[PDB]
Amino acid sequence: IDYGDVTVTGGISVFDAKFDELYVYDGDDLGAVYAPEETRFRLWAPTASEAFVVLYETEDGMPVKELPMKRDVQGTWTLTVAEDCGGLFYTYRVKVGEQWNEAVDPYAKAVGVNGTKTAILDLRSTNPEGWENDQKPPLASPTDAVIYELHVRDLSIHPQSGIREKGKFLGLTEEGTRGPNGIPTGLDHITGLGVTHVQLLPIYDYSQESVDESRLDEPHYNWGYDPQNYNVPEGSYSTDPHNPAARILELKRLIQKLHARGLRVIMDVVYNHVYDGYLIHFTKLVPGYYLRYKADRTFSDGTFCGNECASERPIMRKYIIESILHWVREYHIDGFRFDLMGMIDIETMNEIRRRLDEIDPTILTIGEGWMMETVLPKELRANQDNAEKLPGIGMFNDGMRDAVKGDIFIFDRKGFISGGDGFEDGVKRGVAGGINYGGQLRQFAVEPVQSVNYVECHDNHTLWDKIELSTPGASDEERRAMHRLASAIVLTSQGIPFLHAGQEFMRTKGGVENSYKSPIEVNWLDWERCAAHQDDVSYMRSLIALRKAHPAFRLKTADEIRAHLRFEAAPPHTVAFTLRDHAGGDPDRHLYVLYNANPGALSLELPALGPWEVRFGGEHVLALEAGARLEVRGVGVVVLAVPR
Ligand SMILES: [Ca+2]
Ligand SMILES: [Cl-]
């Protein structure tokens, strides 16, 4: 690999610390700006000796023009083509050292099939009718969101989904779709749940080796965590990957429809690594800059995906931020979930949060704040240890996850719901939003908006499958009750509740622990199973409604939680708490919540706060008597209230 002739850049190597400050482009116009009169190109490539715009008439054709660019300011190259380039494709050809490379524009906003050429297009021809009038469903606080994590192919590819455009963005725009026994499916199923945000697994353009966009007439599946073009949609989710405008219009139609039906959209984004550090446009155009290196000038591989993006270098920080803002401004996206956020530096994350706040503070930022080794210094990683430096950014609460359903790696290990011993405090830490509540009840969050509660996601075994691995002597009914209890804990805890699509019908992957490239038979939303679980779907719907009806479950600040949340007297394998004195403006004076993981009957003394009434789980109540006494039986949640 040739990193360039350093005489081009004042003798400074691309690895040298002084490189960053020499070539920081201050303009917002990297990429190509098309108009019928002319197209303007700007490419950042400080180490190149030569740069060309290569024009193509067809995605797979030969060049029709090969035009040298002019060296410009702050490491950029420019070129104006004073012709109507509409419908053409282009690449950049550069010479770095003795090596020649041809690459897609890193600022590509449209591509041909499989993302190997940039498409020149009038962007506003891709907008749906009335796109400028698109209005977001209201959202007051992040703790008022209920997130539903969904893969575009999973949603509709089951053969009984009743959805026309199976596997596609458009498949999630279809209302009225019906499945086995006539149940609602697709969009109608999701809106019927009452969730507020759909978090979509990678919808940016991922690699051909993951899904080949020219082979969609045979089996295909991938989560898509292999980024290729950060600023354009994935082609396999469009009706026609060969038409550059189709995937853009169809994604916008999807976001437009979801907004009209009361739903916001969160994008799963993967700025921590690329699909191939050797082949990506970054390395072809400016080798050694955009990715992290170890001391021997090989890739740092903290991702375990082959490479890491050097988010901390200013041009890559700029790249990530301008990418996020493109998705906000062009696609009206409502939030971002940062894959392996602990690989991204704190300054970059806080600048992202600031630039989003300037546009719309209700836009969500959550991420995987795992502690992970990388050449990025420890005190600069955007992870749980450093959460006090990352205000307003949510992090998946793995401590809560493990306390509720048991250990994620030792498969037969029980947790709170399955009768394990000593998991009560871990559940309590999550009920409090992961904040510094007091005593032993403390996690990484300063404020509850920093804690995302979940017992299932696309990673690791589903909740149902983990239960099946850890309850050898349990019946199916007993396992269903444990599953329901876990869901109720997520939806009655402080912080941001997060559900995995299909968790409402006890989604199984047949024991597959990491299904990233498993076939659709493993990964689809099984609408047959959904039709067999309509009671469990109604139960999830009623928990979501319960949380919506009670602002006390959604306290915005740690101070309010410390003032109004109190844990109550309880035996082992149970957790009991109150939310007192119209917490968060709740309509009821007090709430009492019982998480019962004991299959037997039991009796509790209630706090002497007034005349308790049932609000939820009345099916579990053997007696409620005004000391005040509650008797219950069975694994499940009960909620009481003292009326105003
Ligand atoms: Ca692709
Ligand atoms: Cl059935």
8 Å CB contact between 34 and 21: no
213 in a labelled binding site: yes
Q: 578: helix, coil or strand?
A: strand
How far does the centroid of ligand 1 lie from the alpha carbon of residue 234, in Å? 5
Active site residues: 339, 368
| Distance (Å, whole) CA 137 – CA 147 | 14
| Distance (Å, whole) CA 129 – CA 368 | 36
Closest CA to 110 of 201, 25, 232: 232
- Burial label for 623, CB within 10 Å (0-12, 13-18, 19+), is exposed
Helix axes 463-470, 398-405, angle to 10 degrees: 50
Closest CA to 469 of 418, 400, 520: 418
> Measured in whole angstroms, how far is the alpha carbon of residue 195 from the centre of its chain?
15
8 Å CB contact between 361 and 139: no
| Distance (Å, whole) CA 246 – CA 256 | 15
How far does the centroid of ligand 1 lie from the alpha carbon of residue 214, in Å? 10
How far does the centroid of ligand 2 lie from the alpha carbon of residue 148, in Å? 24
How far does the centroid of ligand 2 lie from the alpha carbon of residue 507, in Å? 15
Q: 68: helix, coil or strand?
A: strand
Q: Which ligand is nearest to the CA of 275?
A: 1
Write out the H or E segment, with its range, that includes residue 328: helix 314-331
Secondary structure tally for the chain: helices H, strands E: 14, 29
Return phi, psi of residue 198, to 5°: -100, 120
Q: Which ligand is nearest to the CA of 530?
A: 2
| Range list of H helices, 276-313 | 281-285
206 in a labelled binding site: yes
| Range list of H helices, 393-518 | 398-405, 424-431, 463-470, 476-492
Q: Which ligand is nearest to the CA of 202?
A: 1
Residues 6 or more apart whose CB falls under 8 angstroms from that of 109 comprise 31, 121, 123, 231, 232, 326, 330
Residue 620: C-alpha distances to residues 196, 222, 479, 578 (Å): 28, 42, 16, 18
- Please name every residue paired with 56 in a beta bridge, in sequence order, or none if there are none: 63, 89
How far does the centroid of ligand 1 lie from the alpha carbon of residue 277, in Å? 16
C-alpha dihedral over 391, 396, 401, 407, to 10 degrees? Answer: -120
How far does the centroid of ligand 1 lie from the alpha carbon of residue 366, in Å? 25
Q: 406: helix, coil or strand?
A: coil
Question: Which amino acid, one-letter code, is at 286?
Answer: V
Q: 260: helix, coil or strand?
A: helix
How far does the centroid of ligand 1 lie from the alpha carbon of residue 212, in Å? 7
Question: Which amino acid, one-letter code, is at 625?
Answer: E
Closest CA to 229 of 92, 115, 93: 115
Q: Which ligand is nearest to the CA of 104?
A: 1
| Distance (Å, whole) CA 635 – CA 575 | 12
Question: Which amino acid, one-letter code, is at 349?
Answer: M
8 Å CB contact between 495 and 453: yes
Side-chain-side CA neighbours of 449 within 13 Å: the count stands at: 17
351 in a labelled binding site: no
CA end-to-end span of the chain = 72
Could you tell me the fold of the domain covering 6-126?
A: Immunoglobulin-like (2.60.40)
Closest CA to 186 of 198, 197, 172, 199: 172
8 Å CB contact between 470 and 461: no
**Gyration radius from the chain CA atoms:** 26
Residues 6 or more apart whose CB falls under 8 angstroms from that of 586 comprise 550, 551, 552, 579
Question: Which amino acid, one-letter code, is at 177?
Answer: T
Residues 6 or more apart whose CB falls under 8 angstroms from that of 638 comprise 593, 594, 596, 614, 616, 617, 618, 620, 621, 630, 632
Q: Which ligand is nearest to the CA of 205?
A: 1
Residues 6 or more apart whose CB falls under 8 angstroms from that of 453 comprise 397, 400, 430, 489, 490, 493, 495, 496, 497, 498
| Distance (Å, whole) CA 536 – CA 534 | 5
| Distance (Å, whole) CA 123 – CA 134 | 17
Q: 605: helix, coil or strand?
A: strand
8 Å CB contact between 275 and 307: no
8 Å CB contact between 226 and 291: no
| Distance (Å, whole) CA 312 – CA 514 | 30
Residues 6 or more apart whose CB falls under 8 angstroms from that of 31 comprise 41, 42, 105, 106, 107, 108, 109
Return phi, psi of residue 326, to 5°: -60, -45
How far does the centroid of ligand 2 lie from the alpha carbon of residue 181, in Å? 7
Which residues crowd ion ligand 1, with CB under 5 Å? 205, 235
Residue 200: C-alpha distances to residues 160, 395, 500, 618 (Å): 22, 17, 11, 35
